[PDB]
Assembly symmetry: C4
Homo-oligomer: 341 residues x 4
């Protein structure tokens, strides 16, 4: 293989993965309107580059919730990574450690919170949390994250029930027989609490002093409520278009959310990030950093840790080039005048 | 067959029905611009879901013209259902009775008003009426509906003449030889009155104390006239895109009609409803309930009563999921802020 | 053949005509952007039909420049009709006489002004005129039209040079050897005057008392100048998209032109009329009548006079149905509220 | 071959050039969104032609930076023309001399500044300059241009680094073994200075009294800065969509730049010019002249000097026709009312 951009990695993954596994990772909810729009929406935002600014020294570094990262490009939570590669989440965290960026670990990982901390002790690591009907197991996951040097909790708030991904139903999706959630619609309905409310966010805010990011907010009123509840960031996310279909693209709702929080908390984005220009557009519209979901799984499917490292390095280099061609020597000078819809 | 969404049922129906029968049900008028737009328009309306609202208890129940239904999803009038399945309208009403929703019976049914009441005595049933040049047969249909416990009249107002559906002309459409309208362009021209005016609506309003819904209104001025004539609802309908081609999608004209009637009568929608999110969008824009036409015929073509039950259950479950993912525990909290075009 | 709409006639014509002849009639200028848009633009204008208006009696009759016609659908000038059928313009005028509508005869006809008057003595006939460098032959054509009972002059104003139709260049277009202009880019450059100005319109206005329509106006300022020069109508036309490519669709510029002339002269439209709803949209936006170009040639290619009669009857019937379904009993009640873009 | 429009020349070039060479010339950056939009954007600008203006005498002549040219259509800088035809830049300048238009010579030419002046002594010639890390070689190129009768410097300002053109990476692009830059991403990174700032523009303004045009400006604020630094024109350019992908089409940003410079310097356009109507639209929006890149390379690939002459003659004739059909006898009367988006 000669893979030189993120799409090439997806095409390689489709070629090597069983159909059911490829479909599980690629699929969006229902007719997949939002899945298409998470990508298409980035193309509608046009870039207005400044010339002659001195971009010999391009510095991609930034910080996420007070922790330094090498680039505003971080690994989002994607379940059951051992389906893509035998090393699964341990491959991913090692690549993140190499790159100097952070990994958000799925609550539905095929590797334990401790296993991932042991594989990536110097890596920036965060835990994505679902509030389970069993609040004891929920609390155990938070306490394990604290003990094992995870630096934030990303609480997923858009999944009271699992979205309806048709290909998983056609393929009756399940984990391969040798794998386990080491810490799907039927499983969520049995385990994930559809009752959670802002009162549960008050509970979680009381449970941990770790920073908490609300993941899956799409409305400014909800973002302002998250700020009121003492949370420390908002990840603007439509869950990779896998929950409610027909919501807007995340890049289209990002400006409303940035306006609504009035700088009180960091705002992040995921959904459809494939290219360095996507990263640049998200930062111009006020995101501190973006998260990538599917591209990491395609990296694993190609070559485990090295394939994840390659995907992150391609995004890093595309982002550096996009910054340099736009006249940006660092992330602090990426401003709103760089983009227009 | 493994049919898990309404499109799958259409694909199955195309596979099993004779071409002329499939084309009769699928076809729209002329170049079928409105037929495409009734579906496309739903995709342009984007959903803005609220998180963390407590959706453990989702209640889909509502009422139509004062009668309770299990869901805001009802069966619209589609002619000559015995072409799709031997049990035709009797299969449909039995499924409606099972589901707890209502059936609008076509004036051009392959089963009599009494036959359908006998098959579905506990089912909520309404009669769709055409004003025939023969006012005696028109009055006989209304009196039969009253005697047989139908609960409303839906008077179709957009069919002074039949629309021009090219495939029916190519196929010279007729009923199979064993079937009869037990109570097509050539038939309408011989039987349906192209002279009807608001004076005929005054006549019908005087004829029955049953609630009367005007079906096929697309303009706010006409909706206000229907309110002035003492009618009890408006079904925003372009007749499944089979009459005048190039009218707007019903979801696009629904907000004008809801504004125009100022809450004086219930407003309903049909045309292009295929998914639970379509139902949610229509209710967010102020419809009390929606009607489905073609999907019911595809249910019959698959397995008669069980196929209609399956299609209604798929719509019910998609609608519950869409409500839950949007933060709606019941239909009363589905508000206009959930959608933006 | 079973031809039931105008597109079917085009498909039949492509099947029976030599490629060069089909391409000559079908082609637009350059990349054919306007050719596509003359049709696409009609689909963007949506219809807002009134219900319950009494359309038992639909009267399609109107008048063009004071002469009664059976329908607001008239035959536009298309050159060299004997390439499509041996009877050419004589077939066309006979069909117009049968239908009770008017024929605009091309200055580049394969039949003489007298021949066409002899074939269609009771037909409403107008002459389309090019101002030739030879003003004597120009004056001879006008005087012949007057002597032979033609009722107006349509002076084409958008052709100082011929547009560049690539397929004609690829096919090195010429008349078949047995045919003559009985009264192409190379021919225009030799014969049509690229110098004509409003001073030539003053000359033509002085030459004849016949009504004069300016054909090919696309700007309101030019329409107001035509009114100032004493002309009696404006045919909003982009020459069937065969002159300057990238001009707007005629249905899109029609409202500006109707506004600009402030009711001082009749406004007509051609370009992309294929369906009765196209006619209805043009009249709702203020055109008195529309002209059809290519559909008449496809009628000839099918069956000469009978094929032209069939195409005109299909347009008539589609227009009646569109009027009836929109609530219009006559052309005088077709109003601007029937359409929105 | 029968090539009658610029697209035909591209199709011919794809048929005769090695894939890597065709791809080098055709390719845009990354997903090639801007490459598509440079063409698509021209089609969105519609023309509003005036009739009856007297276009017997069409005069295409204009001036660029005070030098007369035969048409507002000039040859832009395209590297390494000897890859397309053995005579490369010498063929191009000879064709420019024949046509009476100007040639912008690439700093990355396969022919020297002196060689091209020797082949085209009477041709209007300008030098496109990159500011190399080696300011001595930069100054040598400027002094050579002055000594050899070049009339302006076009300083490229949008290339601190080379854009990422995927096909060149797939094909590991290099010059054929017999060719040299007689005066690619890896080469730029080694030779082109990513540090250049407006201070380097002050240096260049001090170095030469020749007119200097800033090539690659896309923002009005940058255009105003170029005016402040004493430059003499702005070439609105996205580098043929080969640098930052997702910038707007040049025809879409041209009006902002023309407004921003308030007539203080000439404004030019390149990017997507293929047709005479493209030239007309650019002049209506205020460009003095346009530059063509790829079409010249396709002319060379067809037949060297004669193929470049043919492409320039096709553009000239399409432009004359577009001017004549729009009512423009000369370039001075091409006004903003001819276009609307
Ligand atoms: C295969 C797959 C599994 C996912 N698993 C989880 C999960 O365990 N937890 C979670 O909160 N989100 C999960 N998501 C959502 C991602 O965190 C993220 O929002 C999404 O992948 C971003 O969009 P992208 O894939 O377009 O980059 C998953 C997404 C995918 C594609
Ligand atoms: C096959 C077919 C038959 C129909 N028959 C009738 C009819 O008898 N009476 C009526 O008022 N509308 C009739 N309609 C219109 C439907 O009541 C309804 O407006 C339409 O089907 C809704 O759109 P949908 O098919 O996209 O759900 C018919 C529609 C179809 C597709
Ligand atoms: C084959 C062809 C020949 C034409 N010949 C003439 C002509 O002789 N005189 C003229 O003024 N316009 C001529 N036109 C333009 C037509 O009068 C008319 O503007 C155009 O056909 C209308 O668009 P339609 O073909 O889409 O109906 C011609 C058009 C076509 C397609
Ligand atoms: C093959 C190729 C080589 C180019 N080489 C150069 C170059 O040497 N210098 C430069 O400033 N721009 C260069 N450009 C950009 C062109 O000057 C010009 O901006 C662009 O070709 C215009 O768009 P067009 O190709 O759509 O006409 C190049 C473009 C192409 C396609
Ligand atoms: O809420 C529940 C069960 S509630 C219930 N109701 C009926 N049966 N069970 N838990 C979810 C979290 N928990 C977990 C989280 C991640 C991975 C693993 Cl192993 C475990 C599983 C169990
Ligand atoms: O208006 C008419 C006939 S008027 C007329 N003019 C010339 N011949 N007939 N009726 C329509 C309603 N009627 C009906 C409605 C539904 C089904 C059945 Cl069987 C019957 C049929 C007959
Ligand atoms: O203006 C001219 C010729 S001017 C000229 N310059 C150099 N050679 N000729 N006429 C055009 C009208 N005329 C005509 C119009 C329609 C059909 C027929 Cl047969 C004839 C042909 C001749
Ligand atoms: O800036 C440099 C080299 S700077 C450097 N750093 C490490 N190695 N070299 N020059 C560029 C211009 N120059 C040129 C311009 C056009 C063609 C030709 Cl032959 C030559 C080549 C060399």
């Amino acid at each position: 293989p000669r893979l030189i951009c993120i799409n090439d990695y997806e095409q390689h993954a489709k070629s090597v993965l069983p159909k059911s596994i490829y479909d599980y990772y690629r699929s969006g909810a229902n007719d997949e309107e939002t899945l298409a729009d998470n990508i298409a929406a980035f193309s509608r935002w046009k870039l207005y580059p400044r010339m002659l600014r001195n971009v010999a020294e391009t510095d991609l570094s930034t910080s996420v919730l007070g922790q330094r990262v090498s680039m505003p490009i971080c690994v989002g939570a994607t379940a059951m990574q051992r389906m893509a590669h035998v090393d699964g989440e341990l491959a991913t965290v090692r690549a993140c450690q190499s790159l100097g960026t952070g990994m958000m670990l799925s609550s539905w990982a095929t590797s334990s919170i401790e296993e991932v901390a042991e594989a990536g002790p110097e890596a920036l690591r965060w835990l994505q949390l679902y509030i389970y009907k069993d609040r004891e197991v929920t609390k155990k996951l938070v306490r394990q994250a604290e003990k094992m040097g995870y630096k934030a909790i990303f609480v997923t708030v858009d999944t009271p029930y699992l979205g309806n991904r048709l290909d998983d139903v056609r393929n009756r999706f399940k984990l391969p027989p040798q794998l386990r959630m080491k810490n799907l619609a039927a499983y969520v309905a049995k385990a994930i609490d559809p009752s959670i409310s802002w009162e549960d966010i008050k509970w979680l805010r009381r449970l941990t002093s770790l920073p908490i990011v609300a993941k899956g907010i799409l409305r400014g009123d909800d973002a302002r409520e998250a700020v009121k509840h003492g949370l420390n960031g908002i990840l603007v996310s439509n869950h990779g278009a896998r929950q409610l279909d027909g919501v807007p693209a995340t890049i289209d709702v990002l400006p409303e959310i940035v306006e609504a929080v009035e700088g009180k908390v960091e705002v992040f984005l995921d959904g459809g990030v494939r290219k360095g220009t996507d990263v640049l557009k998200a930062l111009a519209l006020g995101a501190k950093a973006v998260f990538v979901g599917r591209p990491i799984v395609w990296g694993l499917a190609f070559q485990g840790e090295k394939g994840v490292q390659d995907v992150l390095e391609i995004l890093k280099e595309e982002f550096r080039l996009a910054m340099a061609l736009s006249g940006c020597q660092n992330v602090k000078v990426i401003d709103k005048t760089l983009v227009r819809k």
